[PDB]
Enzyme design. Structure first.
Site, short mmCIF file in Angstrom:
data_model
loop_
_atom_site.label_atom_id
_atom_site.label_comp_id
_atom_site.label_asym_id
_atom_site.label_seq_id
_atom_site.Cartn_x
_atom_site.Cartn_y
_atom_site.Cartn_z
N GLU A 365 0.77 -1.26 0.00
CA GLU A 365 0.00 0.00 0.00
C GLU A 365 0.81 1.32 0.00
O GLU A 365 0.21 2.40 -0.03
CB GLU A 365 -1.09 -0.01 1.08
CG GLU A 365 -2.23 -0.96 0.71
CD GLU A 365 -3.39 -0.99 1.70
OE1 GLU A 365 -3.50 -0.07 2.55
OE2 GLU A 365 -4.22 -1.93 1.63
N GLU A 446 -7.09 -7.89 -1.16
CA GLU A 446 -7.76 -7.77 0.16
C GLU A 446 -9.07 -7.00 0.06
O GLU A 446 -9.27 -6.15 -0.81
CB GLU A 446 -6.90 -7.05 1.19
CG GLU A 446 -5.42 -7.44 1.27
CD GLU A 446 -4.62 -6.57 2.20
OE1 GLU A 446 -3.42 -6.84 2.38
OE2 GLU A 446 -5.19 -5.61 2.74
#
Ligand SMILES: OC[C@H]1O[C@@H](O)[C@H](O)[C@@H](O)[C@H]1O
Ligand SMILES: OC[C@H]1O[C@@H](O)[C@H](O)[C@@H](O)[C@H]1O
Ligand SMILES: OC[C@H]1O[C@H](O)[C@H](O)[C@@H](O)[C@@H]1O
Ligand SMILES: [Cl-]
Ligand SMILES: [Cl-]
Ligand SMILES: [Cl-]
Ligand SMILES: [Cl-]
Lengths: 731, 731
Positions: A365, A446
């Site tokens: 991320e 995710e």
């Protein structure tokens, strides 16, 4: 030859930083060890961010003269360093990749003093540090160690390769690695049946392979490659498997045929002990993943994990995503250098497991970072033309240097927010995200997690929405051909930094709890399997009148393999099929029992009283499954569930034992807040509180074996319950 | 001079039924007492449905000849009988009301045996049994017993009328009930002072009394009447107050001045001990409504209660609504008969408490019954003209034979059911609910509960909603003048039957837990008081990051009586007040903090780490309430707060002791599952087990005092917490 040889017994552990050459005094332990044993919730978490020395003693062997003597350490968290009679022989900062230490030239006769430094603290020149992390790192020597005694001229790694893997006449190529030149030689093996052999310095090859079968998620056929060096008798072996794994934008295709990925993320973390869990325990996770939750893919959140784990995924046909360590932070160019060393240390190590199909070369991320990422991308592309390159993100519009746009799609649910017009939407269209109406290969790494936290004991009503949210997504993916698969957040509940969680040091994001006992959502996943693979039917209730709002059990989710399911209670009766009108795209949608199939008038306009019930599943009208709900549950069986009744005299093993409080007809008791007091005798140690607290009517515990034969014997007591016991034999 | 000794001691208790003549070996026990003492949850509830026995060692006296001897049984459950030396002086079935046993005749020199056969079976003939019930009846002579040596001429009862409570000079009318016609003397008095006297054949008047006080919620003035017989020298006291409760379609009136009623529902269920708890404890409950929750009213749900409670509410300015035992079900002729008999027994007993202002003469929530109710109605009103009357229902258009149309609006949240148009509503318009074109006195008597269950452990978002709804109702009620106030279901969670609750034998409906410890929604009633009494400010959060969907604690509720509230975190700082727009009609609308006060990006400052907060409260520029939350709660102080430091050396007293798992800055650890290992030395037994479970970060216990004097050393420990020791003295 050579003698690779485990050596995890007989280590001296000591809180601090000791003079490396003076026989260290401290506590005596067997590896893997974890320096600071924690509570379950609400703890310091820095407690472990300090110094620790371990030590080991090794007598000279008249048998070793002019042969190398090396300590391979499978791993140790972190900032590590090694001594030998007081001389430094290796510094290795990263706490996920292994490292070798050569003893030879500082061994003297009699016993010698190998010493080891661990600093367990968040040292921002070591990745993944220097900022927050939604996971805990622990410390200690948490992986194996191996006493290797090698010949001078000897063999340090090989890459096995598969050109034209789907030829009926298959092909095998090997690139050995060595310490001098000299003929290298080799043998393909299937069990003990020798299939082929070649000989030579450089790239050894075997082709025109009639008779071999392909590695798959169904058929995990492995084969082995023995390597010898004629001129010193060194020998080694590497397993691999014949398979193709393409990521074409039109989808993912194993071995030619296409395949939607279902999947879940996995940490290598346990309660109290952190990462100090060995071969067995690891081997479990993988098994539970593949079987219990029936996923065809795992991802290693957010680092490389155990060889033992990756071995296992090989042996059970479970695909893998493997990512360098990180969690959303980049440090200076020093750190970028450090980070680009892990890529190397990671891929080199696991470039033969057929399970691994993609690699993670972005920090999790993180922002884009052309100049860095360019490096890592370049770096694996050379180290491994075979597996596809990938990275992880959660912004849209990113600088895809990578082969496969691997995103985290937490759109579910922001209808919730006070400023939002976007009607509740489960996943996004791929080009909103990707920034290119040019089709590209696309995966979702995710979803959910922090979006909908769901504790073991959370209301009947919440755990519905929870499950449903895993369905909505799985159903999003399987519908969209553009999206190669999905991977939900996450497999189990983990310990975290103070910055996250319910501020209890727990992210409650699992579909199973931290013991690997399943919360209701586990059978979204576990339920997409075929009946051939096992027969699944859980209703998602506790059969409590006024546990929900208003009450009763309607609507009712039944998660299942089956054509149809029967509601039977209070005289009332219905067959109902899986809800395609709400979940078209799911392999095995679940059954919903509704107003559609029933009204409150049939049960009888709340004619007070609560009556037991009976559900059945059906497969071409052959009564396959049946689950019963008593209307008045009383404590009856205090269950004791070791995964195994039998084990070998092995120190490494961590035995998971579950415990449940069960009512008359078997169902767990979901709201008995209590602590089960337990004893353990013979050759295990319990790990944790001698008093164990139930959540959902359940808890578990691990028993670090002592490596000596005996029968282990285990009480569990609570003054509502007849007095429970179980045993297993050791040896 | 009557002798009224009070003999709850020296008793004997056993299971089953002996011949009522002979000796009985059972344990030397004391009353109040519970027959078979239960777990907190998941248990039999048929455990107590057997015969038991109480026998007593009683002595003759030379002191007693020509003087009636009488045991008064203040309450016992159930089917209760008496024998003196094997002869049967009294039958009573009903286990909530008092009943007398005349031994006189059946007495001899030396020691006379007295027996009591009691059985906790849900006898279908006996109100309150028949079919189902949402509470337990337990068993045990759970209330007092008194011995009474009487002159043969004596005062059994009296009734105090008060015309012109309001006039400056005030009458007191008296109607003593005496065994024989004859003179009766009456001294009114101020606890110490006289005010007037009178002798009397017949009805006793004390006209013209200047300079006395009205009894009100605001101020509780009591006065005692004292009755002598010159003939027999019999003496008895009766206590009362000077009030006026007018009920009108316009609203409820107290001493003329108007009053929106506001309260909650109440049980004598305690945890483990069921009904059996002593005066002191009974008082504390009347105390925790009135003072903590600023509640002007309480509904004795569903039966008459301890006069120790009913006294207490006369004393501390708390109106009362009492009713006959019952629960929806209506028996045969016999059982209805038993009920009008139960009305009679109830009024006669409590006709002088000023606190009580309304009689529930209808069986709780029955369907209408012309023949049966006209009875109870008509009956009560002949027993008591002074007060008004209603009877609790949940059905509309109902035969309103009563003064007051007492309604259970659970309308909220019905639209959650799919077969429902009606848009969300807190309460119904009176107009619709009665089906009576004329306006008539309307009172809302129950709401919420089963509509929205909430464990004390349950997660933030659900909790805010619990609270929300409670507020929503109160607002509506205050808003509409046809509604004379309202009463929340309920104070605490209560133990129950298999047909009701979460399966565990709890109904999680209390705005407090079962230990009379507040959940968040206790401060919705708590924050209605004028600051000038006390100051309350209670945010609704645990200040953990990942606890709520997505994260953070916005939007936030602060429950208060303050002009302002100042929220502070990571350099964001804002004044905010009552959200009056959302709750126009409330006294103390609470403060809500949301998007309108802190914008989206303005949270951007915070980065990814989690931050301490400080919520300050204000009052005319002065800073009153502070509230500190930190971000890394650790185990700091394991708290032990008894109700009391110092006590009487008194057998009857049941001391509530609370436990609290606490962080650095005051706050509790809501998701800390752990038992607290306790131990109690000093002059008292501990009711419940050694090991108590932190539900919601808290957990309660009750210690029964022995009657000995001195020092109660209580100890909590747990290994994450510094061992803690608290004391309480006894004399
Ligand atoms: O849903 C919570 C998750 O968010 C992810 O983006 C992160 O990589 C995970 O470790 C966890 O923090
Ligand atoms: O359904 C159960 C609950 O709701 C009310 O209707 C009733 O009056 C209460 O006594 C409580 O038992
Ligand atoms: O024996 C158990 C079962 O028997 C009956 O078939 C009932 O219909 C069912 O509700 C009950 O649980
Ligand atoms: Cl060959
Ligand atoms: Cl478009
Ligand atoms: Cl009659
Ligand atoms: Cl009065």
């Amino acid at each position: 030859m050579r003698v690779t040889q485990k050596l995890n017994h007989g280590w001296i552990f000591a809180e601090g930083a000791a003079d490396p050459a003076t026989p260290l005094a401290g506590e005596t332990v067997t590896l893997p060890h974890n320096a600071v044993d924690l509570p379950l919730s609400y703890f310091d978490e820095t407690s472990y961010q300090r110094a620790f020395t371990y030590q080991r003693v090794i007598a000279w062997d008249d048998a070793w003269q002019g042969r190398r003597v090396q300590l391979r350490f499978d791993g140790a968290m972190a900032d590590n360093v090694v001594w030998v009679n007081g001389v430094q022989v290796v510094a290795h900062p990263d706490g996920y990749t292994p490292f070798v230490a050569d003893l030879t030239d500082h061994l003297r006769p009699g016993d010698n003093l190998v010493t080891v430094r661990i600093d367990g603290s968040e040292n921002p020149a070591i990745p993944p540090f220097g900022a927050q992390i939604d996971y805990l790192t622990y410390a200690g020597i948490y992986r194996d160690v191996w006493l290797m005694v090698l010949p001078e001229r000897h063999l340090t790694n090989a890459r096995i390769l598969t050109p034209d893997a789907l030829s009926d006449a298959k092909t095998v190529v090997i690139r050995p690695e060595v310490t001098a030149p000299g003929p290298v030689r080799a043998r393909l093996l299937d069990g003990d049946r020798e299939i082929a052999a070649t000989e030579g310095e450089g790239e050894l090859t075997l082709a025109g392979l009639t008779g071999l079968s392909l590695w798959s998620t169904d058929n995990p056929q492995l084969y082995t490659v023995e390597l010898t060096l004629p001129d010193s008798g060194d020998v080694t072996t590497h397993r691999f498997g014949f398979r193709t794994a393409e990521w074409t934008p039109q989808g993912f295709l194993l071995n030619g045929q296409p395949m939607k990925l279902r999947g879940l993320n996995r940490h290598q973390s346990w309660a109290h002990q952190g990462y100090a869990a060995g071969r067995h325990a690891q081997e479990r996770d993988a098994e539970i993943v593949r079987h219990d939750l029936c996923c065809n893919m795992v991802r290693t959140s957010h680092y490389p994990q155990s060889t033992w784990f990756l071995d296992r995924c090989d042996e059970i046909g479970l695909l893998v995503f493997e990512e360098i360590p990180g969690w959303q932070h980049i440090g200076d160019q020093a750190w970028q250098d450090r980070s680009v060393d892990n890529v190397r240390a990671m891929i080199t190590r696991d470039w033969n497991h057929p399970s691994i199909v993609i690699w993670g070369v972005r920090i999790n991320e993180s922002p884009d970072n052309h100049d860095f990422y360019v490096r890592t991308n370049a770096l694996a592309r050379e180290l491994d033309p075979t597996r596809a390159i990938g990275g992880v993100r959660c912004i849209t519009d990113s600088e895809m240097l990578e082969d496969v746009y691997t995103m985290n799609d937490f759109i579910l649910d922001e209808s919730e927010l006070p400023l939002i017009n976007r009607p509740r939407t489960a996943l996004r269209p791929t080009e909103e995200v990707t920034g290119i109406k040019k089709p590209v290969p696309y995966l979702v790494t995710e979803y959910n997690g922090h979006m909908f936290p769901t504790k073991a004991q959370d209301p009947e009503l919440r755990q519905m929405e929870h499950v449903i949210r895993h369905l909505e997504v799985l159903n999003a993916a399987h519908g969209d051909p553009a999206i190669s698969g999905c991977i939900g957040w996450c497999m189990f509940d983990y310990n975290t930094h103070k910055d996250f969680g319910a501020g209890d040091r727990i992210c409650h994001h699992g579909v199973m709890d931290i013991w690997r006992e399943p919360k209701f959502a586990a059978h979204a996943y576990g339920s997409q399997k075929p009946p051939s693979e096992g027969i699944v039917m859980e209703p998602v209730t506790f059969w409590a009148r006024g546990e929900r709002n208003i009450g009763g059990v309607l609507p009712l989710i039944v998660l299942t393999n089956c054509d149809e399911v029967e509601f039977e209670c209070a005289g009332v009766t219905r067959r109902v099929g899986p809800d395609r009108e709400r979940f078209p795209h799911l392999p095995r949608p679940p059954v919903i029992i509704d107003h559609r199939h029933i009204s409150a008038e049939e049960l009888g306009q709340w004619g007070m009283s609560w009556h037991p019930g009976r559900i059945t599943g059906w497969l071409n009208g052959e009564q396959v499954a049946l689950r019963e709900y008593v209307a008045d549950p009383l404590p009856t069986t205090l269950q004791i569930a070791p995964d195994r009744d039998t084990l070998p005299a092995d120190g490494d093993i961590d035995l998971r034992v579950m415990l449940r409080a069960l009512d008359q007809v078997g169902n767990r008791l979901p709201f008995l807040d209590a602590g089960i007091a337990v004893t353990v005798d013979g050759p295990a140690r319990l790990i944790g509180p001698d008093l164990r607290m139930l959540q959902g009517g359940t808890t578990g515990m691990l028993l670090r074996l002592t490596g000596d034969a005996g029968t282990i014997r285990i009480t569990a007591r609570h003054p509502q319950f007849p007095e429970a016991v179980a045993t297993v034999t050791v040896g």
